[PDB]
Ligand binder design. Sequence first.
Ligand code: HEM
Length: 188
Amino acid sequence: MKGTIVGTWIKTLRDLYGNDVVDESLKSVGWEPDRVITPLEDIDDDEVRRIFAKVSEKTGKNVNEIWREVGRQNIKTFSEWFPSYFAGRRLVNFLMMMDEVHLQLTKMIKGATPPRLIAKPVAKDAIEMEYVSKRKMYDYFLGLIEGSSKFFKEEISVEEVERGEKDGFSRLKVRIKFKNPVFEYKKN
Ligand code: HEM
């Protein structure tokens, strides 16, 4: 996982659960007191998994619940640490940009396997977004969408279309419907 993104999770975990939980959890995987992660650094996925496992053990919360709350709260962290991706954008623009953003931010990681997040308009007031990744981080994905709606103050409904796993890739396709129309028909 891209290191500075793991950085946002650590910060979001402190917001949710406190510095003691997080400090103890980072201690258990040997992290310096207290490390600053560089933009080129990759952090091993299994190290992330062990950090979150320690948070689960100390808080008593299931790891999937933690990932969901982290996704919900990490949009705010992103707005602080990566503010250029926000900057007056509308929610639908933000969501439809995510696939390209994740390709850009992992371009110079070796064996980079960013999630794919392709969104396509399906109605004047709706997009379909399909998560595709070997990591199967459904709760984080769904939590980011919910946090995105709160942050942009645009009400959405999220309905699952389908999910699957083939050849190690997990897929989750959701239909995001906006209360207000966000698209118009134009001649192709
Ligand atoms: C400014 C906002 C965001 C930035 C800068 C950002 C960037 C990133 C980066 C660089 C990664 C690591 C990928 C890797 O190392 O392979 C990541 C993880 C992830 N991102 Fe985002 N992201 C943002 C918002 C979102 C949103 C809105 C969604 C979904 C709707 C999303 C879905 C995910 C998921 C599910 C992962 C976990 C990795 C996986 O499942 O394979 N992210 N993010």
